[PDB]
Amino acid sequence: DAATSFLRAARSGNLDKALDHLRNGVDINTCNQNGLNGLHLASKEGHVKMVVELLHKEIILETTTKKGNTALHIAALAGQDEVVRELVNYGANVNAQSQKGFTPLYMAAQENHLEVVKFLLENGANQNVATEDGFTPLAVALQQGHENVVAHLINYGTKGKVRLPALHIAARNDDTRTAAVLLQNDPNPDVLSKTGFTP
Amino acid sequence: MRFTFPLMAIVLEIAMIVLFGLFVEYFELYPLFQDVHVMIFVGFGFLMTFLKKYGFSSVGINLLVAALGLQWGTIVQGILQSQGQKFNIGIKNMINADFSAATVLISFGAVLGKTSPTQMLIMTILEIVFFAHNEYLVSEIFKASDIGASMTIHAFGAYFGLAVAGILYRSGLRKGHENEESAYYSDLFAMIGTLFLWMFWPSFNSAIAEPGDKQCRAIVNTYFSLAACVLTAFAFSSLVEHRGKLNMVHIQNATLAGGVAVGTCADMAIHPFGSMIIGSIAGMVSVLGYKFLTPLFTTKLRIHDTCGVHNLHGLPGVVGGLAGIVAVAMGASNTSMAMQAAALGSSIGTAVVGGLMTGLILKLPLWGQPSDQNCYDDSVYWKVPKTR
Amino acid sequence: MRFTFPLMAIVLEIAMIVLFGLFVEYIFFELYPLFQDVHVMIFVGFGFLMTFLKKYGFSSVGINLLVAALGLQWGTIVQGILQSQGQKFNIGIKNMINADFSAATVLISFGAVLGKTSPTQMLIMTILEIVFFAHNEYLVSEIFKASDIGASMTIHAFGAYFGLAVAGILYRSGLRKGHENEESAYYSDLFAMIGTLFLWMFWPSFNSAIAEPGDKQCRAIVNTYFSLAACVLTAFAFSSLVEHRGKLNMVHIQNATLAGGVAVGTCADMAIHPFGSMIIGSIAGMVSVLGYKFLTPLFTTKLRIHDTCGVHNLHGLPGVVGGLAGIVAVAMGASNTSMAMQAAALGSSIGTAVVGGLMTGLILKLPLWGQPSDQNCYDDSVYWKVPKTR
Amino acid sequence: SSKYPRSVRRCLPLWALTLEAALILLFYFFTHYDQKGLVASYQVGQDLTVMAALGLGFLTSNFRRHSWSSVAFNLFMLALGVQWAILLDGFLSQKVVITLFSIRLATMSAMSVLISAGAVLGKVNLAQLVVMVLVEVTALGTLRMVISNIFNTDYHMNLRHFYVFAAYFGLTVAWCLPKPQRATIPSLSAMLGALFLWMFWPSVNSPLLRSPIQRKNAMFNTYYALAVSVVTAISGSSLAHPQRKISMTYVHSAVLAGGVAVGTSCHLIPSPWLAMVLGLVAGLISIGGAKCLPVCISVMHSIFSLLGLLGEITYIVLLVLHGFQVLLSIGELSLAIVIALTSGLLTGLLLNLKIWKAPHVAKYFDDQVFWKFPHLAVGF
Amino acid sequence: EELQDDYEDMMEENLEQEEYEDPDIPESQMEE
């Protein structure tokens, strides 16, 4: 009853009720019968504050559903731009693959989510990672007639990560919470930028 | 040899001319004939244009097969009705010839993308012979009522094509083919044939109906059966698909199952609500067939059906025959129940056996059959444009 | 200059309204289904048949619609004035069918100059060609009193030859060796199949609309039906025969399959017999395919006449064959009327078509109607807003 | 909220199957059955059916990625609307005797909804269209019954107002929806639909005319007015376009201008020149509406509404020739427009409900919302 | 705006590597 109510609060964005449940002792890593934890549901519904709070309370960021979908997969398929930016800021793997081989960039490209596609490309998403059927983000964008996504995917090409590493971004804003989450995930504080500078 | 197809076409046409000279002599039903004609050449022709690289062959071989079929069916049905003497050509001869063309096109839908035009000419000739003999048996020996031809046209063509496709089974195509896939504008073009068939099916079921109460009953029952069938086909297409998405195969085909399943009961006093029930069951059955039975037929029974003509013509045709039997049992018609059952069994059995012999003839490597890799490709028999 | 096309169209429409007010006043429901089939032919069959060009579908179907819509009004006026000899006349279903026939003749001629003309040129050619066609058909039906119920001579041969004459006056050297836009596409060919199938299906109504009710109308329907059936088989066979590696050509399948309907027209209501109708259709399909394969390159490269849709191979050669068949039927004695008058109708149709086309093309040549440049031929974007996405 | 569509696997099948079961039960309880011109009378209804399915379904298929939904949703709406219209005209005009004439009238009632749906297609799912079909058919029947009760006209004869009712109902429903393109091949398919509509619109202008001479004159007037309107629409399109080119989208609807202009008065126009004048004026008004209405959502629906109003006005002008009748007819038109707008408001507020699982505004005009496509990630 | 500093080029320009180098010791010789 408590875990199910916590998941309902995560879905509806009731951050106060979810925080009360977490204070009571509900396991933050609990998930429904589909394997969606609170982070997955919040990423689906675009609840940015809930996503941030759950990341601060040490939820496993790369937990996959029964379909292999991370929270970033779900936010990209749902077209939740702010959630995608926040998850990438906290160290979400932009090149994660589901069981069927889908990447977050593929999910954004198939759903005509231009802003998510551009943000993932600037964060080093590889557009050449194919699914188990051999389809690329460009291929599915062409099949679905998403002309803007196709054009942006062609123009970007293989330029790569033009955003700073997430720890550099956190150090620029003096953000200790995001830096703490990032260092909990990746224990290397000397992550290098392309210019060679540490955070 | 590349000259097989033109030589066969010319020889068949010359034989048609000679037979017409030997056996043939010279207005209220003409609009109904034109409705049936539009069904034959546009509805069936563009209904199979869903394949992304087989639109040319689908529509063109539809035109060629039906053009040969109307002549050969005219000849065969006329000789059967005249018992070998000369006979006159009315509007009813043209309507029945278009019906024979419809049967051959239904069977063509089973082997679409895997056969040559030469095979199609041969299958047209043989299948029309078998279909005309079965239709004569049903109409004259059994004297069963099949005004919409659920048994004699739809079930016969479907099971004939299934037998042919079973004989022509390719082990390399059981798991699927890269060319066996629809395209966006191709499905849009298939919607044209779907809409024309749906619009003109009442004339199909009422063209040769007895004028008066029977013809009006056929029109009204067919219309309301189709109306219910559309709703139930949409609903079950949503029901059987992930997240309730609509499948264009179901919308293109299962929406027409009401026309097939009401055909036996079209001119009977089954009431609009009875026709609606028949159409609803037909839409349900067709969607379920497309979703579940077609993969079972392809993978386990080794019967690949390209257009899923089983789910549109065979199962709804069997349902129509069973509905005719039940309607007789309820007193909706004066025909004997045993004769309706005999007509159903004869249609299925004659279709299967004729399809086996016809497919055995078609299996001979003399007709330019496509290779496994070149299946569902227009480029084998057509000059294909370089852009879409 | 900019407003030439709308100004000419509004002036023509006001003229049509004035003529209808001055001359036009108000069996119908028996012939109306056949008129509906003819109408569908005129506006869907020809219009989508000409949409095989990959970059000219909009202009094909839309200019077909414009030409036929203006043509029904103008043909009503001209044919009614000719029949009444200048007096006020009533209009029935037959006037509607005859006006649609005049529109069909103009559309056949348009198929020759498709992709190289402007809508203004098309309006002018419609107005002039309907006059020439109506005078020729009046001569054939009333002075010669020949039998042309399917109009192999008065519609098909006339439109083909008149269009070819206009094309020769309008012929452009930059187009002799082909054009990058004179070129088909997959879905464009499917639309052309829509047009072909509708023409093929509704041709019996076309050939039997004006036939005398009873035996003649039924004979026309049956003969057209079986002639088209035989024509499909022979067209497929010879398309396989003449092409490289036996591959079928969509040009042949789109056009030569209607040659049997074209060629049976003069003999449609005659007692040719179904086998006789079938023989004409088989010859028609053969001749149309051979024309497309051999005569069209000869006409374009050496003739100096460019025929975009190959309307010669569908309407002119099968039309001449239909006229020849009608003369043979009189020799057979199946049909009344003299051989000499059938031959006169054929010769007059061809001669009036060539003369009227030459004068009309001389008018259309003037550099005032906004005709496309050589590079912009067969391109919708000259006159239409073309979507970026195909 | 999530831009990914919610699963309709439980809503849409339950809704459609419950509707069909209810229709079958009502047909069983309330409908009942029952010569020389059997085929001739059948052909008029067949022509209406051809128009409703083909012309209206393909006319709206011009969208780049919404042709499937336009065609198939139009088919579904026609199938539902004819059944519901049969039942409704049975209930409000008496058991229900089913004849070809009743099927023809129910088809006209369905085409009213099909015309209205063009203003909302690409922005709704199938369940919302079901709601729109039911409410619009009911509202049209209520309007006809109210006119029959007040102005003492026949219930079936009041279906003449269906152009103006459909136009304003569709505009109102579209105005209630949340706020948000072409391709060559869908444009050609839409031209096919527009051509069939234009070719058979004389069957729209005389289903309800019992007399033969009235049908003849109305059919002639519609044919000639449509020809004039086609010429005017194609020629004047270049004037009403920024790039001075002919707009295929404008042509697709402006071809029907003369038919709408003479729709309610073609039986009273005595000479073809007057119908030709009305077609010309309709074409010019279409040019002006294309050039001016966008300055002041669907522009083609807006000019359709203007043209329906113009047809009503020319009916008023002609009815005097063949002033209390003017007042009665103006009151009839005002009541029709008022009921159309009010029922459109109600339908739009019903369509805005959350339970319909309507597409996100970022996903308008996209078949991927409703249809299965291969190589897609599905679900979460 | 407010997010340009998250990109590598803008961060490179902000850090000003040229300010940690010895640019030159200019003489500007009077003769030529």
Ligand SMILES: CC(C)CCC[C@@H](C)[C@H]1CC[C@H]2[C@@H]3CC=C4C[C@@H](O)CC[C@]4(C)[C@H]3CC[C@]12C
């Ligand atoms: C009409 C249908 C539904 C019922 C009757 C079809 C039967 C007779 C057909 C369909 C499936 C067919 C079989 C399918 C596959 C094979 C394997 C092949 O290497 C030899 C032929 C063989 C063994 C076929 C023989 C005929 C067959 C058994």
Ligand SMILES: CC(C)CCC[C@@H](C)[C@H]1CC[C@H]2[C@@H]3CC=C4C[C@@H](O)CC[C@]4(C)[C@H]3CC[C@]12C
């Ligand atoms: C196809 C097999 C499974 C049978 C299922 C079809 C059933 C549902 C159909 C077929 C025949 C139909 C009947 C045919 C005739 C009549 C007589 C009429 O006055 C009332 C309806 C009634 C009684 C129909 C009801 C529905 C019916 C029973």
